Write an enzyme that holds these catalytic residues in place. Structure first.
Site, PDB file in Angstrom:
ATOM      1  N   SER A 112       0.753  -1.116   0.026  1.00 25.11           N
ATOM      2  CA  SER A 112      -0.043   0.224   0.132  1.00 25.11           C
ATOM      3  C   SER A 112       0.787   1.346   0.043  1.00 25.11           C
ATOM      4  O   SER A 112       1.505   1.570   0.890  1.00 25.11           O
ATOM      5  CB  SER A 112      -0.872  -0.051   1.020  1.00 25.11           C
ATOM      6  OG  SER A 112      -1.829   1.235   1.159  1.00 25.11           O
ATOM      7  N   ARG A 113       0.675   1.960  -0.955  1.00 17.08           N
ATOM      8  CA  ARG A 113       1.699   3.267  -1.097  1.00 17.08           C
ATOM      9  C   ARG A 113       1.391   4.073   0.271  1.00 17.08           C
ATOM     10  O   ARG A 113       2.503   4.619   0.755  1.00 17.08           O
ATOM     11  CB  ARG A 113       1.411   4.210  -2.076  1.00 17.08           C
ATOM     12  CG  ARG A 113       2.032   5.362  -2.391  1.00 17.08           C
ATOM     13  CD  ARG A 113       3.881   4.858  -2.443  1.00 17.08           C
ATOM     14  NE  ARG A 113       4.389   6.251  -2.640  1.00 17.08           N
ATOM     15  CZ  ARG A 113       4.734   6.781  -1.573  1.00 17.08           C
ATOM     16  NH1 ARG A 113       4.462   6.532  -0.323  1.00 17.08           N
ATOM     17  NH2 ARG A 113       5.566   8.010  -1.628  1.00 17.08           N
TER      18      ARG A 113
END
Lengths: 131, 270, 122, 72, 122, 72
Positions: F2-3
């Protein structure tokens, strides 16, 4: 009815069929066994064994060790043993010749011990082959 | 190209079949080796029963046998029992690597190592490195026989009796597990008169009890379990008559034990 | 074949049957090499149970009555589930393997087994 | 593969062929073992041994078609 | 290449050459991965023979004297059959493999082998 | 990935799940060569036994979502 024989090598039990007489070499020089023998333990020298059961008696050369004989029973601990019929005589003789030649050359305190024990080994091989 | 990819896949599939066949064959060979060890059990069961009773009868200070004779450890002979061929994990690398530590350790003690090498990968190792002495190069052998352990024994026994080398010790891999088999180094000569067999580190098992290796399947997987059955030694007959001398009879006995031990060390390694 | 869909009991048995069947497939190479005696006592069993399960899966069909002569058996979903419990719980370990072959209900295999014993005795 | 299968063969052929297909199937399973036939038991070794002979039956020179009795 | 056209002597050797090369082709994948030592004596013999046979087929041409550097050779049908038969027979198993590369006649290969041995001694 | 990995989480989660993220990282590598070393010392084994249990936590039944406190 008779005493029973089991000769055995470090990998292989050779003779476990039972007999009326054997006669084996030893370090004392010679001994004979007949049934209901008294309990004895002999260190057996390298050199031929002769075993008689019934009709036929044959020699398998065997390479030294230990032989105890109990009540109604023999067991022989030998580090190497061959039947004298199963070795072909001429090849054994050739091996003996090679051993002798190497011995004649062989020199020095260990090495001769090896040569001498090898020629002693080789010479007894034909003596079961001929017999 | 698609055809090239197909060819590559076919070759990989062929390789998978071949390796699988090799694995099966190797397992069968190991089973055969286990059967071989079992066949020589009567000889080592009977020998340790005799070697026990020959010691318990003896009890004599004046008796000294050459094989068991102890001399100052100025020089040591190490015999290396490696596998005959390649493609077997790190079995050969591990042994030679473990061999080096023993040679290295001797330099700290400086007591003049000598190597008897058994098997081809050990032979080709110590040929290419000449900064080591070699006693002899022995051919390796599958299906080891008492013929083939005798030429090892005629070397070592002869070498040991002369005082040039002392405390001859052997390293090989006791077949403990399939997944790992670490090299262990034992002290072959001078045979203990108690017949106890012990490692260099200093742990000695009684010779009466030894464990054969049996390979069985645990759960789904194929394993091996080394289980030890003690062989009791029946007391010697009261009326027993010794043909030669007790010291002399014992002297004949020791080589049989040494020969028997070298054969097991090599069979287990194989 | 999810537990929320077919119920907890049905799912457990199905999963077990696949596992038992799966283990037997893996063991086939091993059994040839080590034989059935050399396997451990759990794997003498999951080989035997797997064989019985394999035979139990096969069934006589209504359509094949012409061709084979033995009457087909429509087998309920409950009689199937109850049948593979008795094989996997080991309560039917004593029965021969050809009592589970081409039978419909679990009871038929037992009935077939008993008849085989009587015939053998004869 | 043949969809028609043993409907096509004669009755005499069906009996003989059935044994042959099974033996051939076993040999295709054991082509990987053929390099290693020495280190195998008799049942496995015989199958490899039989299979190789079975493969030799199949071979034929060009335009030497065998009659059905010769195939049987 | 049919025995009614080329005779049964030529055809058997042309057929046995391909079986030796076919075997070698199959084994190429296996030997690289498992080394030469995983082969049987029989398999090794064909590989040694195939390798020798493969080199022998090569020939220096009259035209490719600028490419080969060695003078080209014309080889009859008879020379080839005679030459191939010996390699297949195994009489030439003792020779090194480079005695076969870019020689015309079989005799030339033997001569080359002698020269190679002489060079090796020095 | 997840960025926006952890500016996303709550403070209880960032603290609690900091431990978790590492243990799974250990346990990817300890499951590797687990059957190769095969005689597992308790430095590797207890971290490998911890790992299997960690995987069990990740398991959940369909459509039974957990509250944030439960997850923490």
């Amino acid at each position: 009815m008779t005493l029973n024989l089991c000769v055995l090598t470090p990998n292989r039990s050779i003779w476990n069929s039972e007999v009326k007489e054997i006669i084996l070499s030893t370090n004392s020089g010679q001994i004979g066994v007949l049934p209901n023998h008294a309990p004895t333990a002999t260190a057996v020298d390298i050199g031929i064994l002769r075993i008689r059961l019934n009709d036929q008696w044959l020699t398998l050369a065997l390479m030294g060790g230990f032989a105890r004989i109990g009540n109604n029973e023999i067991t022989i601990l030998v580090n190497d043993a061959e039947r004298g019929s199963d070795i072909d005589p001429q090849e054994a003789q050739q091996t003996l010749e090679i051993a002798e030649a190497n011995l004649r050359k062989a020199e020095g305190k260990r090495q001769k011990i090896e040569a001498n024990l090898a020629l002693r080994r080789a010479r007894t091989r034909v003596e079961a082959s001929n017999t | 190209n698609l055809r090239e990819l197909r060819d590559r896949i076919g070759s990989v599939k062929n390789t998978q079949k071949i390796t699988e066949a090799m694995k099966l064959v190797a397992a069968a060979k190991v089973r055969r080796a286990q059967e071989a060890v079992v066949n020589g059990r009567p000889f080592s069961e009977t020998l340790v029963e005799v070697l026990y009773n020959m010691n318990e009868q003896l009890q004599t200070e004046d008796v000294d046998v050459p094989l068991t004779k102890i001399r100052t450890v100025k020089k040591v002979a190490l015999m290396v029992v490696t596998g005959d061929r390649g493609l077997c994990g790190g079995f050969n690398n591990m042994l030679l690597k473990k061999a080096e530590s023993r040679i290295a350790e001797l330099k700290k003690l400086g007591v003049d190592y000598t190597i008897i090498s058994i098997g081809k990968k050990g032979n080709t190792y110590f040929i290419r490195r000449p900064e080591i002495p070699v006693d002899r190069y022995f051919d390796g052998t599958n299906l080891p026989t008492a013929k083939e352990a005798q030429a090892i024994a005629d070397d070592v026994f002869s070498l040991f009796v002369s005082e040039e080398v002392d405390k001859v010790e052997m390293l090989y891999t006791k077949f403990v597990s399939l997944v790992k088999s670490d090299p262990v180094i034992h002290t072959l000569l001078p045979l203990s008169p108690k017949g106890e067999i012990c490692d260099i580190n200093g742990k000695c098992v009684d010779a009466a009890e030894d464990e054969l290796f049996r390979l069985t399947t645990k759960e789904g997987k194929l394993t091996v379990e080394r289980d030890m059955i003690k062989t009791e030694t029946p007391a010697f007959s009261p009326i027993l008559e010794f043909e030669q001398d007790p010291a002399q009879i014992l002297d004949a006995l020791l080589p049989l034990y040494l020969n028997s031990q070298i054969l097991r060390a090599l069979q287990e390694s194989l | 074949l999810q537990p929320r869909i077919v119920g907890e009991e049905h799912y457990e048995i199905a999963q077990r049957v696949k596992e038992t069947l799966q283990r037997y497939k893996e063991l086939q190479d091993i059994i040839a090499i080590l034989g059935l005696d050399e396997l451990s006592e759990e794997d003498r069993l999951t080989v035997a149970r797997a064989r019985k399960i394999e035979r139990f899966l096969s069934q006589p069909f209504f359509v094949a009555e012409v061709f084979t002569g033995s009457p087909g058996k429509y087998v309920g979903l409950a009689e199937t589930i109850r049948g593979f419990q008795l094989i996997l719980s080991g309560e039917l370990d004593s029965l021969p393997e050809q009592a589970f072959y081409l039978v419909g209900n679990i009871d038929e295999a037992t009935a077939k087994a008993m008849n085989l014993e009587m015939e053998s005795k004869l | 593969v043949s969809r028609v299968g043993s409907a096509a063969q004669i009755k005499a052929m069906k009996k003989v062929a059935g044994k042959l297909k099974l033996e051939l199937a076993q040999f295709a399973e054991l082509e990987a073992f053929a390099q290693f036939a020495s280190d195998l038991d008799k049942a496995t070794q015989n199958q490899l041994a039989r299979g190789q002979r079975l493969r030799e039956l199949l071979k034929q020179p060009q335009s030497a078609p065998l009659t059905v009795e010769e195939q049987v």
